[PDB]
Amino acid sequence: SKAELQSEERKRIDELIESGKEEGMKIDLIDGKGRGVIATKQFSRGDFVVEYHGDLIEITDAKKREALYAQDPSTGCYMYYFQYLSKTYCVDATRETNRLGRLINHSKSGNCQTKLHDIDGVPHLILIASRDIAAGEELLYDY
Amino acid sequence: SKAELQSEERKRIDELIESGKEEGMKIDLIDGKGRGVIATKQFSRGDFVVEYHGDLIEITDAKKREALYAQDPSTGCYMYYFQYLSKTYCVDATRETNRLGRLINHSKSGNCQTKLHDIDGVPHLILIASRDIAAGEELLYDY
Ligand SMILES: COc1cc2c(NCCCCCN3CCCC3)nc(N3CCCC3)nc2cc1OCCN
Numbered sequence: 391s392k393a394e395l396q397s398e399e400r401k402r403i404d405e406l407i408e409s410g411k412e413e414g415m416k417i418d419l420i421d422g423k424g425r426g427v428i429a430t431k432q433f434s435r436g437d438f439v440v441e442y443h444g445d446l447i448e449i450t451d452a453k454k455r456e457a458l459y460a461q462d463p464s465t466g467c468y469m470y471y472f473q474y475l476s477k478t479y480c481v482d483a484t485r486e487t488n489r490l491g492r493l494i495n496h497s498k499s500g501n502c503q504t505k506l507h508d509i510d511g512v513p514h515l516i517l518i519a520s521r522d523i524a525a526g527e528e529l530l531y532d533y
Numbered sequence: 534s535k536a537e538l539q540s541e542e543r544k545r546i547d548e549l550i551e552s553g554k555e556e557g558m559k560i561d562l563i564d565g566k567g568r569g570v571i572a573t574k575q576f577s578r579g580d581f582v583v584e585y586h587g588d589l590i591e592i593t594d595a596k597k598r599e600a601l602y603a604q605d606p607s608t609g610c611y612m613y614y615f616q617y618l619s620k621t622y623c624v625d626a627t628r629e630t631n632r633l634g635r636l637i638n639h640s641k642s643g644n645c646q647t648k649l650h651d652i653d654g655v656p657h658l659i660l661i662a663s664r665d666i667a668a669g670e671e672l673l674y675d676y
C-alpha cells in the first residue's frame with residue numbers, strides 16, 4: 391500500500407532521530423575548523439539527512455536566551471523559530487556541540503530542505519534531501 | 534483617577550507611534566556612520582522613547598524573508614519574533630531606513646526596555662525608559 395509505505399518511512403525517520411547516529415556524512419575541515427558537511431553516501435530525493443538538533447523551547451524561554459546571547463556579539467544566530475499546530479517553538483542550536491545539522495551551510499539552490507517531523511506530539515526540525523544527492527557533495531540547506 | 538491617568542498615557546503613546554516623529558534623540562555618528570542613538574532630552578521612568586519600527590509580519594512571511602536574507606551573509610539579524618494574545622508575529626527591521634529605533638545598541642544594564650503596545654488590535658514593539666534618563670546619555674536597550 392502507498393499509505394502502508396509512508397507509515398514505514400515515518401518509523402524509520404523516528405528511529406534515526408531518536409538514535410541520532412548521523413551517518414553518511416562528515417565534517418569538511420579547513421584550517422582545523424569544521425566549516426561544512428560533506429555527504430559520504432548517496433541520498434535519494436525525500437530521504438532523511440539529519441536533524442537540526444539543539445534545544446526545543448517555547449517563546450518565553452526563547453526571549454530569555456536571546457537576551458543572554460545579546461551580551462556576546464561574536465554569537466551566531468542559530469535560533470530557528472517556527473509554528474506547530476496552535477503552538478510556537480524555537481530550536482536553539484547556539485551552543486557548540488558535535489552535532490552536524492548545525493554545521494551545514496545554506497545555499498539558495500541547496501540539496502537539503504527543512505521539514506517538521508512529529509514524534510508523538512514533539513516537533514523535530516529535520517533536513518531531507520530535495521533531490522538525489524551524490525556521495526562527495528557538500529550538503530547545503532534552504533527552507 | 535489612577536485608571537483615568539493610565540488611560541491618558543496610552544492615548545499619548547498612540548499619537549507618538551502614529552506620527553512617528555522620534556524627537557528627543559539623535560544619531561551618534563562615528564566616521565560618517567550612524568552607530569548609536571543619544572538622548573537629547575530627559576526621559577522619566579516609564580516614558581515612551583521610540584518604536585522598534587520595521588514591518589510587522591506573521592510566521593509564514595517571516596520564513597520567506599528569512600530565506601532571502603540568508604543569500605546575503607553581511608545581513609544583520611533584525612527580525613524580532615514574539616507572541617501576542619493567541620497570535621505569533623515578527624517585527625522585521627532588516628531594511629535600512631531613517632528610523633532610529635533599530636540603531637539603538639543593546640546593553641545588559643540598559644536604560645530602555647521592550648513593551649508591547651496595542652492600538653486597536655495591532656501590536657507595536659516600543660522601547661520605554663527603564664529608569665530616569667539624562668539628556669546626553671546613549672540610549673541602550675535590553676528585553
Ligand atoms: C550562524 O550559522 C548558522 C545558522 C543556522 C541557522 N540559524 C537559525 C535561522 C536564522 C537565520 C539567520 N537570519 C539572518 C537574518 C535574519 C535571520 N539555522 C540553520 N538551519 C535551520 C534549519 C535547517 C538548518 N542552520 C544554520 C547553520 C549555520 O551555520 C552553518 C555553518 N556556516
Ligand SMILES: COc1cc2c(NCCCCCN3CCCC3)nc(N3CCCC3)nc2cc1OCCN
Binds near residue numbers: 459609639658
Ligand atoms: C543587528 O543589529 C541590531 C539588531 C536588533 C534587533 N534584532 C532582533 C533581535 C535578535 C537579536 C539577535 N540574536 C543573536 C543570537 C540570537 C538572536 N532587535 C532590536 N530590538 C528588539 C526590540 C528592541 C530593539 N534592536 C536591534 C538593534 C541592532 O543594532 C543596533 C546598532 N548596533
